[PDB]
Paper text:
In Drosophila, an RNase III enzyme Dicer-2 (Dcr-2), aided by its cofactor Loquacious-PD (Loqs-PD), has an important role in generating 21 bp siRNA duplexes from long double-stranded RNAs (dsRNAs). ATP hydrolysis by the helicase domain of Dcr-2 is critical to the successful processing of a long dsRNA into consecutive siRNA duplexes. Here six cryo-electron microscopy (cryo-EM) structures of Drosophila Dcr-2–Loqs-PD in apo and in complex with dsRNA substrate in the absence or in the presence of ATP were captured, illuminating the continuous conformational changes of Dcr-2–Loqs-PD after binding to dsRNA and translocating until forming the active dicing state and cleaving the dsRNA substrate into an siRNA duplex in the post-dicing state. Loqs-PD is a cofactor protein that comprises two dsRBDs that are responsible for recruiting siRNA precursor substrates for Dcr-2.
To capture the different steps during the translocation of Dcr-2–Loqs-PD along the dsRNA, we used cryo-EM to analyse the sample of Dcr-2DDNN–Loqs-PD in complex with the dsRNA substrate under conditions with ATP and Mg2+. Through single-particle classification, we captured two representative cryo-EM structures of Dcr-2–Loqs-PD in complex with the dsRNA substrate in translocation states. We captured another structure in the mid-translocation state, in which about 17 bp of a dsRNA duplex threads through the helicase domain further towards the catalytic centre of Dcr-2. When superimposed onto structures of the initial binding and early translocation states, the cap–core modules sway back about 2 Å towards the dsRNA. Importantly, in the mid-translocation state, the C-terminal dsRBD of Dcr-2 appears in the map and interacts with the dsRNA substrate, resulting in further bending of the axis of the dsRNA about 25°, and the trajectory of the dsRNA is directly towards the PAZ domain. During the translocation, the interactions between the DUF283 domain and RIIIDa/b domains, including relatively flexible interactions between the DUF283 and RIIIDb/RIIIDbi domains, and relatively rigid interactions between the DUF283 domain and RIIIDa through the DP-linker domain, remain almost the same as in the initial binding state. This suggests that the overall domain configuration of Dcr-2 is relatively rigid during the translocation process until the dsRNA terminus reaches the Platform–PAZ domains. A comparison of the cryo-EM structures of the early- and mid-translocation states also demonstrates a very similar structure in their helicase domains, of which the ATP-hydrolytic pockets have an EM density for either ATP or ADP-Mg2+. Moreover, DUF283 interacts with RIIIDb and RIIIDa, blocking the access of dsRNA to the catalytic centre of RIIIDa/b and preventing non-specific cleavage of dsRNA during the translocation.
Residue numbers in the entry:
A (entry chain A): 1428 to 1552, 1602 to 1722
B (entry chain A): 2 to 689
C (entry chain B): 344 to 359
D (entry chain F): 149 to 197
E (entry chain F): 297 to 345
RNA sequence: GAGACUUGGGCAAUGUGACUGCUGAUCAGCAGUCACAUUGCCCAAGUCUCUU
């Protein structure tokens, strides 16, 4: 009864749950008092984090040979980053089945999902987006451990992970996955310097002072927090540099 | 200060008697009773110097509120030569471990602070009752019900019954509330709660005459006719407000925590909607009680409060709600200012025009108040005048402060002699009228009052008692006197010579107020006669009634290591533990209670289930106490909740979540437990 | 009432 | 009906009024015995004696 | 025991002035319950006679 | 049985006076916890530049 139309989730995900209890525990956000029969999803995401990171690291170690470890660690960190997990969870329409309730968290999820719909459910490679919901990537990563425990086989879990990550794998393997921010600082002519950002309510800003095409330009960007305001400034600096390059 | 402080004729005998036996002092405010308390502290300092284990001790001075604790801390520090430790809840002693508690205990000779901190640190085995020399209580009349003073006193009953620390209580009022009836039983309950005998002034001519330097103020009163007709614009504003209420309840925000009755009997509006409706209803009461000009003053405060709340409103829907409230308040402000300016056409003398507008649109009570101020201050010097006014509502304070601002700007005689200022209780409201932090400021309104910056203060019972204020000469009370304690404490403030006590009441309420004033005077007198003639007993050595005072509640449970758990603190401990679990905003940590049903009551319990009620506790899914816990069957829902929380926290302690010292465990305890298991090889390398 | 009726201009403080 | 009866005295003729006298062995009915003077006051003024 | 004996006469007389069978059956059931209670209580009485 | 009176009994209606608990709403006063924000002390840690 908790899992309304769970067959839709299974069909989209591609796996079948012989026991549905693991799915309920994985979908049980801590803010959901009506579920007295299973625990929260923290005790599953704890294992799922290790499962995901080890599996993907082993895959890239075996396959992506022609690159140094100094960038292989960056690739694995990008592929395990919570933002990519949130994007993947958005792609598979898993927001529907999250047995969660909250005032502001639900608003954040709605804003993120409509933003991703605007982007076409593709990674914005890093996002100038308002704010990313951590719990979304958390529940997506936890359902991986839920899938594994339902079968106790690594091979099936890896098939599921690969089926979920095929576009991300093919993208990050070809193009440089991410460095960002730092490459702006170390850029050939871009020498960004910044002031201290201040948050207020649900708005934030930072004065970005950088250089571009041998000139000096100041840019601003929408965001949520101090460091993510600096992130928005970095995103718009990257946009200006790319457009000037283009 | 210095040693020029010379004890009076009554302080010496008071401290001499208090040395022999425990007792409570009862002297009028400003009679230097804290000074004789200091002298008492100067007779129990023998064990201050030596450390705890070597045989040395300390002393605990007690207070109810933070500010009074701090003020008396500076007082004792400047009056003595001891290392006075000052600690409160906000000071940061919450996370203090054993070592950085022990250092403070061993680096001080006397401790001061609030009730909760001292009570908790006594219950957390940091010190023992046997490890104390003398304990000093002030405003001892607070010691009733579940108040922390009585809870701390119960530790005297549960702990050792030999070489027990002294207890002394400081007060000037003995009764809290409208229970003036049967003063003798209240006095006896106060006697037994602090296991002492009240000692009071006795030798009339030599000593009460000297003590009466805290002179009794002269008291007067003024009556005014009732205003009965209601203005036409008021009902229009009420109609707009009620349709706004209908829209607000109709409009839809996301899921919000369910707030219900304090007895869980039925539902309530969501906290934000209840809050905004409380604002609007309070402003409406302001309008009817004080007219239109005062309403015009208060609507600006509502505007600024709504703007601040919308600014801090995280969710967009809450921002829309506050925006709609702001639009309605702006419309109300437009109508009010139009009505106020509707009369200003005829006259064109700006100062006199504003003065007569204030007089014209005001309620008769406020008109009488302002004319009384004009005829009392009488255009005198601004330095000598230092007057107080008491009003009941918080927003009434700010509104009347604005009204006095405008009126003082409207009279040349008062424009140079009065400097109004207001302050309220802990739920402080911004004194601004334009925007949040219009300017950064560093002086409290009380301090400005003390330095002569503000000769007139507006305040609720927040400035009634405790906080030291110079001898006032004029005190005014607008809203009706509510209790005995506030009346007597207010009349004690007007300490200077020929001080004036002033209060106001309506025409049809004067006769009622006669009984309250005469009853309060009789209640002050009969205490004097009865204590003057009480039975000469030593220290209330009736241990049978001492243990028969508290037994009717749930017996407090103590484990090994000497830690003791108070059943009345079970709710606080449970909620504090719940807050430890990390969560997002709406992720609730508070345990959602549930009252049982009689059919379910005897479905789970015996025949006694029908007679008395039971409440059930549920826990958030993150807490490992997944299984629900059913409270013991108690009579009322209050004791049911107390028993439920006590049993639940006992189960938590048994499971080890609650530590030995009865506090939730951080990661420090976890890593300490794991260290000698998983990280033993660090020690052979000299680390850990 | 349009205008609140004015209280007595002359008034003194009665003693309880 | 005691003070109900005696309220007739004000509305009816206040002069050439029959003598009224109160007879009792107790004065206070209920647990409001506190401040006996003020409670005896309305007894005095209700019975115009 | 005396109380349950007393209840019998009041229940019976109430049934006597009872108007229709709907309350007659109610009083009859009440009397049967009262008599069963009385019998149980007198068994309790005689247990230690 | 009725008409009326005498006394009593039965039922009902409604009102009055008092008491014990139980909650409701509003308002003031007090304590504690958690979190966020401001900048700084600030070491860890990686990157990068200079350079050590
Ligand atoms: N015998 C005395 N010696 C020295 N100072 C005194 C004496 N009596 C009164 N005082 C001073 O008068 C002041 C009275 O204020 P306080 O004692 O705080 O009033 P209360 O104790 O009633 O609240 C004290 O600050 C105290 O220093
Ligand atoms: Mg004092």
């Amino acid at each position: 009864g908790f899992l309304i139309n769970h067959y839709y989730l299974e069909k989209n995900l591609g796996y079948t749950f012989k026991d549905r209890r693991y799915l309920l525990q994985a979908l049980t956000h801590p803010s959901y008092p009506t579920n007295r029969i299973t625990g929260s999803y923290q005790e599953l995401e704890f294992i799922g984090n290790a499962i995901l990171d080890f599996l993907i690291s082993a895959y890239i170690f075996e396959n992506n040979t022609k690159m140094n470890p100094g960038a292989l660690t960056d690739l694995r960190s990008a592929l395990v980053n919570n933002t990519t997990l949130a994007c993947i969870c958005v792609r598979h329409r898993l927001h529907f089945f999250i047995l969660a309730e909250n005032a502001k968290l639900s608003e954040i999820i709605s804003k993120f999902v409509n933003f991703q719909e605007s982007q076409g459910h593709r990674v914005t490679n890093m996002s100038t987006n308002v704010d990313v919901p951590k719990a979304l990537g958390d529940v997506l990563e936890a359902l991986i451990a839920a899938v594994y425990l339902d079968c106790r086989d690594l091979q099936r879990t890896w098939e599921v992970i690969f089926n979920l990550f095929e576009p991300e794998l093919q993208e990050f393997t070809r193009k440089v996955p991410i460095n960002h921010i730092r490459q702006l600082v170390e850029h050939k002519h871009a020498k960004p310097v910044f002031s201290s950002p201040i948050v207020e309510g649900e708005t934030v800003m930072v004065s970005c002072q950088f250089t571009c095409m041998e000139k000096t330009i100041k840019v601003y960007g929408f965001g949520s927090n101090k460091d993510q305001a600096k992130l928005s400034a970095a995103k718009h600096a990257l946009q200006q540099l790319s457009k000037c390059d283009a | 200060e210095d040693v020029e402080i010379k004890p009076r004729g009554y302080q010496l005998r008071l401290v001499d008697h208090l040395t022999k036996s425990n007792g409570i002092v009862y002297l009028p405010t400003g009679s230097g009773k804290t000074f004789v308390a200091i002298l008492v502290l100067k007779r129990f300092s023998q064990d201050f110097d030596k450390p705890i284990e070597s045989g040395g001790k300390r002393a605990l001075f007690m207070c109810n509120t933070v500010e009074l604790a701090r003020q008396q801390a500076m007082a004792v520090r400047r009056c003595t030569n001891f290392k006075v430790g000052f600690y409160v809840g906000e000071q940061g002693v919450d996370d203090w471990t054993r070592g950085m508690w022990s250092d403070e205990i061993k680096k001080n000779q006397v401790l001061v602070g609030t009730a909760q901190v001292f009570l908790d640190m006594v219950t957390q085995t940091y010190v023992a009752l046997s490890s104390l020399s003398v304990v000093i209580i002030d405003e001892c009349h607070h010691g009733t019900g579940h108040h922390p003073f009585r809870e701390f006193m119960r530790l005297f009953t549960i702990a050792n019954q030999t070489k027990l620390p002294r207890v002394v209580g400081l007060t000037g009022v003995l009764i809290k509330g409208n229970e003036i009836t049967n003063v003798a039983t209240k006095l006896k309950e106060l006697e037994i709660t602090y296991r002492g005998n009240i000692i009071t002034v006795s030798d009339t001519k030599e000593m009460e005459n000297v003590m009466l330097y805290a002179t009794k103020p002269t008291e007067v009163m003024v009556s005014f006719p009732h205003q009965e007709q209601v203005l036409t614009v008021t009902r229009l504003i009420s109609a707009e407000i009620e349709k706004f209420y209908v829209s607000l309840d109709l409009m839809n925000i996301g899921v919000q925590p369910i707030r219900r009755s304090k007895s869980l009997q039925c539902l309530r509006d969501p906290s934000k909607k209840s809050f905004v409706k409380q604002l609007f209803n309070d402003f409406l009461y302001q309008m009817k009680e004080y007219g239109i000009y005062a309403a015009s003053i208060a609507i600006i405060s509502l505007i600024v409060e709504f703007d601040i709340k919308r600014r801090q409103a995280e969710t967009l829907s809450v921002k829309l709600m506050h925006r709609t409230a702001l639009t309605l308040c702006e419309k109300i402000r437009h109508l009010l200012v139009q009505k106020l300016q509707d009369m200003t056409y005829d006259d064109d003398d700006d100062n006199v025009n504003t003065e007569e507008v204030i007089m014209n649109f005001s309620t008769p009570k406020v008109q009488r108040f302002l004319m009384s101020l004009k005829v009392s201050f009488a255009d005198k010097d601004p330095k000598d005048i230092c007057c107080l006014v008491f009003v009941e509502r918080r927003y009434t304070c700010k509104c009347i402060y604005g009204l006095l601002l405008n009126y003082i700007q409207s009279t040349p005689e008062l424009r140079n002699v009065l400097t109004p200022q207001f302050m309220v209780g802990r739920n402080n409201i911004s004194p601004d009228f334009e925007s949040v932090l219009e300017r950064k400021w560093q002086k409290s309104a009380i301090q400005q009052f003390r330095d002569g910056n503000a000769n007139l203060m507006i305040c609720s019972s927040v400035l009634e008692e405790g906080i030291d204020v110079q001898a006032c000469n004029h005190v005014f009370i607008l809203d009706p006197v509510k209790t005995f304690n506030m009346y007597v404490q207010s009349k004690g403030r007007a300490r200077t010579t020929e001080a004036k006590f002033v209060l106001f009441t309506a025409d049809k309420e004067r006769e009622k107020t006669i009984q309250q004033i005469y009853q309060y005077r009789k209640a002050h007198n009969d205490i004097a006669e009865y204590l003057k003639d009480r039975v000469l007993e030593k220290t209330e050595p009736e241990l049978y009634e001492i243990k028969g005072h508290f037994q009717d509640d749930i017996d407090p449970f103590t484990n090994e290591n000497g830690a003791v758990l108070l059943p009345n603190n079970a709710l606080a401990i449970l909620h504090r533990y719940c807050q430890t679990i990390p969560t997002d905003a709406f992720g609730f940590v508070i345990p959602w209670f549930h009252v049982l049903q009689e059919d379910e009551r005897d479905r789970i319990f015996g025949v006694s289930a029908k007679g008395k009620h039971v409440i059930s506790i549920n826990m958030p899914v993150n807490c490992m106490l997944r299984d629900t816990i059913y409270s013991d069957p108690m009579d009322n829902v209050k004791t049911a909740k107390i028993s439920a929380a006590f049993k639940a926290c006992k189960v938590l302690y048994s499971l080890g979540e609650l530590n030995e010292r009865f506090v939730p465990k951080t990661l420090k305890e976890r890593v300490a437990s794991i260290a000698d298991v998983h990280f033993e090889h660090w020690n052979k390398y000299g680390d850990s | 009432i349009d205008r609140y009726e004015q209280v007595s201009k002359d008034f003194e403080f009665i003693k309880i």
